[PDB]
């Protein structure tokens, strides 16, 4: 009602003011973190069936 | 076995722990939880205190009822402090064995007509059936014979009605008592498509039979559930 | 989001909910007062009072249509153009979002 | 020979019109073996069907009656194989395929009991599988029992049971026992859909439940009890052609218009 | 949690004695219970097992007819059924809680003891304030497993009350972390940094894996 | 204020759409994707009772716990398919589980509003409860642990509540949403998290200063499951309306909407592989679907269950997928 959108704004200014970054630097990080980062991942790349603890 | 010692006792703690379950699983499996879902100002509150004061926490959201009846058991779960958005805790009962939907049909409705139309419609509360429940009877002849200005100018279709065939009452209470019947199972039959069938009563305060109102018409779900999966109904 | 911004008896005045932020094509966005539904592209509507006012849909227009015309002075209150979330599913379940 | 011969309750010739019996039999069991055995070919291969303890019994009474009409089948060809014991391999296999049909049968009763009559603590935990404790162990005690007196060397036409109280004492003394049970549950299972049921489509519906019930509890096989009856022998005709394609309308009823393997047909 | 032992010693040779073991404070039915010797001119030597349940009831091959072991879980006590009470069933019998899951800790807590007296994987290792010290005990075999890690229990014990677990290379919650362990399938040992007034005593090796479960001697810390 | 306050959330779209240079599958249109990968279920977890509402795995990679409502929080041994502890819960409706990092501790956050804090590591072998959560005032959707004595709870009043054990009581009380908040996924440096609710906004929090940082609109539904993209600096949000959303922490957008036209179930399940480049969600359908997080691809089915898939988790390891359906099993994949 009111007292419910007296703290709207006040939860709603400090979303406006933020360092929103560049849409596409900031895919680029996400590329970036799975380019990195994709060797230790069990899903991209399928560890052998004899180093993961799922066999038989 | 190739297993060692402390994983030959992590299965024999595990097939222990599914010897719990498997004695949990005859009190899952022997045991119909039951949704109920009166709403404000309806007969839920009561029917709770009736159903199990006939037969066995400052906000908690559900109040567990334990009633047995013919030596079988059910857990009414009313739901209590979940607030009105019922969208997605309402999916949590899709594998109960019905749903005690009470009714105020003294107020009026639309209201419970269109929880009940959202209750059936659901993805996930089709093919589980509404036990429709239709409690406080006493003071909805008082709102049709006895006081008679809650007549049905909220219900157009109303003058386009009469009691077709049906179960001393009064006959326009009779007419009214079912027609808030009527008014569910226009909304109920339209898309049940067989896979859930409402099965509506008549309750009060002093019912006393409302235990035996649900169990006798929780066999016809669980009777209608396996009668389906011999494909004969 | 999910914008849904809405728009001396016997007169009919019909308000315009704007539906924005969504697809509302699957959605079966119907109506609540504070003193009703619709389906997907219309076609299946139900109502409450079942003739005084009509629940017209604009998918293309993305917008829901409530027409009332012989409106008693009890419907005269608050109107929401409320919208039913789970799509493709008549699921139409304080009501505050 | 004709499809009878399990359950003849009369042991003697029927044979100017058993030439007509067995056209009858061996192209029931060619075409039920063809269709309730894909009954179990989309059944086995789909978790989705079997998950109803109804639907995990008729798996049972499926391949209960594809082996009881394929050991038929073969009981010609394990005719031809004139070894002793060639013959005996068959009559021991068609007498354990058809007491477990038999149970099958009775099973599917004493599920129904459960099922739909005691509706409620239905609950036995290993259900399925002490059923075929029931459905394969109890036959397998049972033949075990016929193997043991070993009169008139239990076999022998195509080799069925050739004894007088070994055939009626095991056989039809136990069928009549389970058919008793069957029937029951035919009865009370028809006077509990008339109540959930409460003339085309309402009659025909009452059919299409009546007889996938006579099929499921093999109410047809009681025929040999009206085919004691010394005028009427179109019950023998009526039970090589009711009992045999037992196995197509097993598939026509409760896996056609199941709906829910059309559902699993497609993809 | 209090593992107190209602049996009695001084008993005849050839005695058939039966011993108690009163559980408490702890989900008793939900423990592996065990049976671990200590005779008073030596060190640990394990006698039996019950899991939780009845199944996998284990002996060592010297008790393997002579002692039986049989749990009430309604009365809530372990029961040590000893038969033909001779020479080396003389020992101060422990009691051992022990729950077997994934990230459990085994052997981790232990009974007073009773003081009972008549009238595989042989591992064992050497005898023997504020500095580290190590202990080097050896295997019989391999305890890698393949599967988990090396399956050796490292028990420290006051000389004058009832042994406790240290290591179950993971330390038990009811022993500091100035105690540590390593090893490489064969060889282990336990590598105390700063030993106090609580560390003197008689340390154990006891392996997991062939069911047999032997200790050593131990060092002996004084 | 309502017509005042709108133009300020305008400030926020058209801020956003300042930052709006070039769509992340505009990004990566020239990146190698997963392609279709089969992926196997390694062990069915046979044992619950009923409906597999939320699992949560360890951060040992090994242990995991699943609730299911039947009042059963079962914590499975998943490599070697053992069950290590199963607890009879006193809130029989479990909505949602969340396994503590330390591994001792293990919640089950019932449709009962406790948060029954569950120890397993007690002196005794019975898997006591520490501290039930009393309080909170809708159903607990989500939780997941910070630490031992801390616990972040969604519930299904809109609002989010930081607990602490020890004592018994909510720290903090996040009340951003305007709608019920059906999941929550604690951020790989456990000092942010982000809630997705049924107000179609998933919103990110400091758990600190327990104020909405970020609120990420975009979904046309309810968000029914949420994870974190494992680097911390995004997480993909799964609705109702079968379009899962990769949102971009400090950067207020969505990035990749996960959408197939042939999918109209809700997204009940969302989860992130280690890389975070294999987004895992699990669909109402019966099966998940490993889409790649960055080309936005279909890039694999997971379709082990019978019914909806309502929890989906890829272990700290990233080497398992648990897969808890409303059935009682958990097929754990690769």
């Given at each position: 009602?009111?007292?419910?959108?007296?703290?709207?704004?006040?939860?709603?200014?400090?979303?406006?003011?933020?360092?929103?970054?560049?849409?596409?630097?900031?895919?680029?990080?996400?590329?970036?973190?799975?380019?990195?980062?994709?060797?230790?991942?069990?899903?991209?790349?399928?560890?052998?069936?004899?180093?993961?603890?799922?066999?038989? | 076995?190739?297993?060692?010692?402390?994983?030959?006792?992590?299965?024999?703690?595990?097939?222990?722990?599914?010897?719990?379950?498997?004695?949990?699983?005859?009190?899952?499996?022997?045991?119909?939880?039951?949704?109920?879902?009166?709403?404000?100002?309806?007969?839920?509150?009561?029917?709770?205190?009736?159903?199990?004061?006939?037969?066995?926490?400052?906000?908690?959201?559900?109040?567990?009822?334990?009633?047995?009846?013919?030596?079988?058991?059910?857990?009414?779960?009313?739901?209590?402090?979940?607030?009105?958005?019922?969208?997605?805790?309402?999916?949590?009962?899709?594998?109960?064995?019905?749903?005690?939907?009470?009714?105020?049909?003294?107020?009026?409705?639309?209201?419970?007509?269109?929880?009940?139309?959202?209750?059936?419609?659901?993805?996930?509360?089709?093919?589980?059936?509404?036990?429709?429940?239709?409690?406080?009877?006493?003071?909805?002849?008082?709102?049709?014979?006895?006081?008679?200005?809650?007549?049905?100018?909220?219900?157009?279709?109303?003058?386009?009605?009469?009691?077709?065939?049906?179960?001393?009452?009064?006959?326009?209470?009779?007419?009214?008592?079912?027609?808030?019947?009527?008014?569910?199972?226009?909304?109920?039959?339209?898309?049940?498509?067989?896979?859930?069938?409402?099965?509506?009563?008549?309750?009060?305060?002093?019912?006393?039979?409302?235990?035996?109102?649900?169990?006798?018409?929780?066999?016809?779900?669980?009777?209608?559930?396996?009668?389906?999966?011999?494909?004969?109904? | 989001?999910?914008?849904?911004?809405?728009?001396?008896?016997?007169?009919?005045?019909?308000?315009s909910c704007a539906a924005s932020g969504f697809t509302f094509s699957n959605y079966k966005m119907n109506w609540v007062r504070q003193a009703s539904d619709i389906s997907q592209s219309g076609a299946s509507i139900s109502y409450t009072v079942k003739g005084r006012f009509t629940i017209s849909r604009d998918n293309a227009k993305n917008t829901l249509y409530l027409?009332?015309?012989?409106?008693?002075?009890?419907?005269?209150?608050?109107?929401?153009?409320?919208?039913?979330?789970?799509?493709?599913?008549?699921?139409?379940?304080?009501?505050?979002? | 020979?004709?499809?009878?011969?399990?359950?003849?309750?009369?042991?003697?010739?029927?044979?100017?019109?058993?030439?007509?019996?067995?056209?009858?039999?061996?192209?029931?069991?060619?075409?039920?073996?063809?269709?309730?055995?894909?009954?179990?070919?989309?059944?086995?291969?789909?978790?989705?069907?079997?998950?109803?303890?109804?639907?995990?019994?008729?798996?049972?009474?499926?391949?209960?009656?594809?082996?009881?009409?394929?050991?038929?089948?073969?009981?010609?060809?394990?005719?031809?194989?004139?070894?002793?014991?060639?013959?005996?391999?068959?009559?021991?296999?068609?007498?354990?395929?058809?007491?477990?049909?038999?149970?099958?049968?009775?099973?599917?009763?004493?599920?129904?009991?459960?099922?739909?009559?005691?509706?409620?603590?239905?609950?036995?935990?290993?259900?399925?599988?002490?059923?075929?404790?029931?459905?394969?162990?109890?036959?397998?005690?049972?033949?075990?029992?016929?193997?043991?007196?070993?009169?008139?060397?239990?076999?022998?036409?195509?080799?069925?049971?050739?004894?007088?109280?070994?055939?009626?004492?095991?056989?039809?003394?136990?069928?009549?026992?389970?058919?008793?049970?069957?029937?029951?549950?035919?009865?009370?299972?028809?006077?509990?859909?008339?109540?959930?049921?409460?003339?085309?489509?309402?009659?025909?519906?009452?059919?299409?439940?009546?007889?996938?019930?006579?099929?499921?509890?093999?109410?047809?096989?009681?025929?040999?009890?009206?085919?004691?009856?010394?005028?009427?022998?179109?019950?023998?005709?009526?039970?090589?052609?009711?009992?045999?394609?037992?196995?197509?309308?097993?598939?026509?009823?409760?896996?056609?218009?199941?709906?829910?393997?059309?559902?699993?047909?497609?993809? | 949690?209090?593992?107190?032992?209602?049996?009695?010693?001084?008993?005849?040779?050839?005695?058939?004695?039966?011993?108690?073991?009163?559980?408490?404070?702890?989900?008793?039915?939900?423990?592996?219970?065990?049976?671990?010797?200590?005779?008073?001119?030596?060190?640990?030597?394990?006698?039996?097992?019950?899991?939780?349940?009845?199944?996998?009831?284990?002996?060592?091959?010297?008790?393997?007819?002579?002692?039986?072991?049989?749990?009430?879980?309604?009365?809530?006590?372990?029961?040590?059924?000893?038969?033909?009470?001779?020479?080396?069933?003389?020992?101060?019998?422990?009691?051992?809680?022990?729950?077997?899951?994934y990230g459990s800790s085994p052997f981790d807590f232990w009974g007073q003891g009773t003081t009972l007296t008549v009238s595989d994987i042989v591992m064992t290792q050497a005898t023997s304030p504020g500095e580290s010290v190590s202990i080097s005990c050896r295997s019989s075999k391999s305890l890698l497993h393949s599967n988990g890690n090396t399956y050796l229990?490292?028990?420290?014990?006051?000389?004058?009350?009832?042994?406790?677990?240290?290591?179950?290379?993971?330390?038990?919650?009811?022993?500091?972390?100035?105690?540590?362990?390593?090893?490489?399938?064969?060889?282990?040992?336990?590598?105390?940094?700063?030993?106090?007034?609580?560390?003197?005593?008689?340390?154990?090796?006891?392996?997991?894996?062939?069911?047999?479960?032997?200790?050593?001697?131990?060092?002996?810390?004084? | 204020?309502?017509?005042?306050?709108?133009?300020?959330?305008?400030?926020?779209?058209?801020?956003?759409?300042?930052?709006?240079?070039?769509?992340?599958?505009?990004?990566?249109?020239?990146?190698?994707?997963?392609?279709?990968?089969?992926?196997?279920?390694?062990?069915?977890?046979?044992?619950?009772?009923?409906?597999?509402?939320?699992?949560?795995?360890?951060?040992?990679?090994?242990?995991?716990?699943?609730?299911?409502?039947?009042?059963?929080?079962?914590?499975?041994?998943?490599?070697?398919?053992?069950?290590?502890?199963?607890?009879?819960?006193?809130?029989?409706?479990?909505?949602?589980?969340?396994?503590?990092?330390?591994?001792?501790?293990?919640?089950?956050?019932?449709?009962?509003?406790?948060?029954?804090?569950?120890?397993?590591?007690?002196?005794?072998?019975?898997?006591?409860?520490?501290?039930?959560?009393?309080?909170?005032?809708?159903?607990?959707?989500?939780?997941?642990?910070?630490?031992?004595?801390?616990?972040?709870?969604?519930?299904?009043?809109?609002?989010?509540?930081?607990?602490?054990?020890?004592?018994?009581?909510?720290?903090?009380?996040?009340?951003?949403?305007?709608?019920?908040?059906?999941?929550?996924?604690?951020?790989?440096?456990?000092?942010?998290?982000?809630?997705?609710?049924?107000?179609?906004?998933?919103?990110?929090?400091?758990?600190?200063?327990?104020?909405?940082?970020?609120?990420?609109?975009?979904?046309?539904?309810?968000?029914?499951?949420?994870?974190?993209?494992?680097?911390?600096?995004?997480?993909?949000?799964?609705?109702?309306?079968?379009?899962?959303?990769?949102?971009?922490?400090?950067?207020?957008?969505?990035?990749?909407?996960?959408?197939?036209?042939?999918?109209?179930?809700?997204?009940?399940?969302?989860?992130?592989?280690?890389?975070?480049?294999?987004?895992?969600?699990?669909?109402?359908?019966?099966?998940?679907?490993?889409?790649?997080?960055?080309?936005?691809?279909?890039?694999?089915?997971?379709?082990?269950?019978?019914?909806?898939?309502?929890?989906?988790?890829?272990?700290?390891?990233?080497?398992?997928?648990?897969?808890?359906?409303?059935?009682?099993?958990?097929?754990?994949?690769?």
């Amino acid at each position: 009602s009111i007292a419910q959108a007296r703290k709207l704004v006040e939860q709603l200014k400090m979303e406006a003011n933020i360092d929103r970054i560049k849409v596409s630097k900031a895919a680029a990080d996400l590329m970036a973190y799975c380019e990195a980062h994709a060797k230790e991942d069990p899903l991209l790349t399928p560890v052998p069936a004899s180093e993961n603890p799922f066999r038989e | 076995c190739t297993l060692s010692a402390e994983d030959k006792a992590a299965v024999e703690r595990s097939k222990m722990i599914e010897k719990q379950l498997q004695k949990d699983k005859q009190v899952y499996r022997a045991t119909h939880r039951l949704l109920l879902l009166g709403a404000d100002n309806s007969g839920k509150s009561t029917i709770v205190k009736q159903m199990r004061i006939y037969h066995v926490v400052k906000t908690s959201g559900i109040f567990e009822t334990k009633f047995q009846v013919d030596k079988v058991n059910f857990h009414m779960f009313d739901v209590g402090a979940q607030r009105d958005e019922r969208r997605k805790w309402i999916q949590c009962f899709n594998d109960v064995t019905a749903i005690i939907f009470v009714v105020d049909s003294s107020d009026y409705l639309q209201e419970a007509l269109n929880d009940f139309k959202s209750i059936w419609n659901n993805r996930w509360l089709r093919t589980i059936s509404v036990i429709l429940f239709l409690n406080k009877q006493d003071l909805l002849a008082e709102k049709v014979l006895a006081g008679k200005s809650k007549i049905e100018d909220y219900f157009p279709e109303f003058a386009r009605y009469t009691t077709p065939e049906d179960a001393g009452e009064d006959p326009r209470v009779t007419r009214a008592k079912y027609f808030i019947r009527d008014e569910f199972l226009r909304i109920s039959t339209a898309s049940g498509d067989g896979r859930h069938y409402c099965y509506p009563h008549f309750t009060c305060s002093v019912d006393t039979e409302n235990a035996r109102r649900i169990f006798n018409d929780c066999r016809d779900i669980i009777q209608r559930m396996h009668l389906r999966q011999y494909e004969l109904l | 989001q999910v914008q849904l911004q809405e728009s001396q008896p016997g007169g009919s005045l019909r308000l315009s909910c704007a539906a924005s932020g969504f697809t509302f094509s699957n959605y079966k966005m119907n109506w609540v007062r504070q003193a009703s539904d619709i389906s997907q592209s219309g076609a299946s509507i139900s109502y409450t009072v079942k003739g005084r006012f009509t629940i017209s849909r604009d998918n293309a227009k993305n917008t829901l249509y409530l027409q009332m015309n012989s409106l008693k002075p009890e419907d005269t209150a608050v109107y929401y153009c409320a919208r039913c979330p789970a799509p493709f599913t008549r699921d139409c379940f304080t009501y505050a979002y | 020979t004709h499809f009878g011969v399990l359950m003849d309750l009369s042991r003697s010739t029927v044979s100017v019109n058993e030439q007509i019996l067995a056209l009858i039999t061996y192209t029931g069991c060619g075409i039920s073996s063809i269709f309730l055995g894909v009954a179990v070919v989309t059944y086995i291969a789909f978790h989705k069907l079997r998950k109803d303890y109804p639907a995990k019994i008729l798996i049972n009474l499926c391949t209960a009656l594809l082996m009881l009409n394929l050991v038929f089948l073969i009981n010609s060809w394990l005719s031809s194989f004139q070894k002793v014991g060639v013959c005996i391999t068959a009559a021991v296999a068609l007498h354990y395929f058809l007491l477990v049909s038999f149970t099958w049968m009775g099973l599917e009763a004493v599920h129904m009991y459960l099922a739909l009559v005691k509706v409620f603590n239905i609950y036995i935990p290993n259900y399925i599988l002490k059923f075929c404790l029931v459905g394969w162990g109890i036959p397998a005690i049972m033949v075990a029992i016929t193997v043991s007196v070993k009169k008139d060397l239990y076999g022998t036409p195509f080799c069925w049971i050739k004894d007088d109280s070994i055939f009626y004492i095991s056989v039809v003394a136990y069928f009549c026992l389970i058919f008793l049970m069957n029937l029951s549950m035919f009865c009370t299972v028809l006077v509990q859909l008339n109540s959930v049921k409460s003339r085309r489509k309402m009659i025909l519906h009452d059919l299409k439940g009546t007889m996938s019930l006579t099929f499921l509890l093999g109410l047809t096989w009681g025929f040999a009890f009206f085919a004691w009856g010394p005028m009427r022998n179109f019950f023998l005709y009526l039970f090589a052609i009711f009992n045999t394609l037992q196995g197509f309308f097993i598939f026509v009823f409760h896996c056609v218009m199941k709906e829910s393997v059309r559902e699993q047909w497609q993809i | 949690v209090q593992l107190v032992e209602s049996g009695g010693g001084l008993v005849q040779p050839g005695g058939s004695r039966k011993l108690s073991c009163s559980a408490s404070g702890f989900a008793f039915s939900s423990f592996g219970m065990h049976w671990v010797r200590q005779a008073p001119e030596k060190g640990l030597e394990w006698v039996a097992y019950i899991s939780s349940g009845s199944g996998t009831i284990y002996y060592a091959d010297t008790v393997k007819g002579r002692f039986t072991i049989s749990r009430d879980d309604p009365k809530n006590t372990l029961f040590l059924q000893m038969t033909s009470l001779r020479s080396e069933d003389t020992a101060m019998y422990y009691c051992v809680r022990s729950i077997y899951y994934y990230g459990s800790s085994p052997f981790d807590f232990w009974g007073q003891g009773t003081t009972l007296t008549v009238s595989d994987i042989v591992m064992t290792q050497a005898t023997s304030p504020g500095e580290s010290v190590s202990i080097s005990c050896r295997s019989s075999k391999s305890l890698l497993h393949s599967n988990g890690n090396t399956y050796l229990y490292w028990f420290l014990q006051r000389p004058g009350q009832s042994p406790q677990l240290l290591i179950y290379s993971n330390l038990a919650s009811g022993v500091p972390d100035r105690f540590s362990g390593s090893g490489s399938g064969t060889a282990f040992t336990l590598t105390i940094s700063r030993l106090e007034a609580e560390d003197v005593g008689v340390y154990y090796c006891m392996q997991h894996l062939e069911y047999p479960l032997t200790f050593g001697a131990g060092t002996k810390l004084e | 204020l309502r017509q005042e306050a709108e133009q300020l959330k305008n400030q926020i779209r058209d801020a956003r759409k300042a930052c709006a240079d070039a769509t992340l599958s505009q990004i990566t249109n020239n990146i190698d994707p997963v392609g279709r990968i089969q992926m196997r279920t390694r062990r069915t977890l046979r044992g619950h009772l009923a409906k597999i509402y939320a699992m949560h795995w360890g951060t040992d990679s090994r242990l995991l716990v699943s609730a299911s409502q039947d009042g059963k929080l079962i914590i499975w041994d998943s490599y070697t398919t053992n069950k290590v502890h199963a607890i009879p819960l006193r809130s029989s409706w479990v909505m949602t589980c969340a396994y503590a990092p330390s591994g001792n501790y293990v919640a089950c956050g019932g449709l009962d509003n406790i948060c029954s804090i569950y120890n397993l590591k007690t002196r005794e072998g019975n898997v006591r409860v520490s501290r039930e959560l009393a309080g909170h005032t809708g159903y607990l959707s989500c939780c997941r642990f910070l630490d031992d004595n801390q616990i972040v709870t969604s519930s299904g009043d809109t609002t989010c509540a930081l607990w602490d054990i020890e004592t018994g009581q909510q720290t903090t009380t996040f009340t951003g949403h305007t709608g019920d908040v059906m999941s929550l996924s604690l951020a790989p440096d456990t000092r942010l998290f982000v809630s997705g609710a049924c107000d179609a906004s998933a919103k990110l929090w400091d758990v600190r200063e327990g104020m909405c940082r970020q609120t990420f609109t975009g979904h046309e539904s309810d968000i029914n499951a949420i994870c974190f993209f494992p680097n911390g600096n995004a997480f993909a949000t799964g609705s109702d309306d079968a379009t899962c959303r990769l949102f971009d922490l400090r950067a207020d957008q969505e990035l990749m909407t996960y959408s197939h036209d042939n999918i109209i179930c809700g997204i009940t399940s969302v989860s992130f592989s280690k890389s975070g480049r294999l987004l895992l969600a699990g669909y109402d359908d019966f099966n998940c679907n490993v889409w790649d997080a960055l080309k936005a691809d279909r890039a694999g089915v997971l379709a082990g269950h019978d019914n909806r898939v309502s929890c989906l988790g890829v272990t700290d390891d990233g080497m398992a997928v648990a897969t808890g359906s409303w059935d009682s099993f958990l097929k754990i994949w690769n």
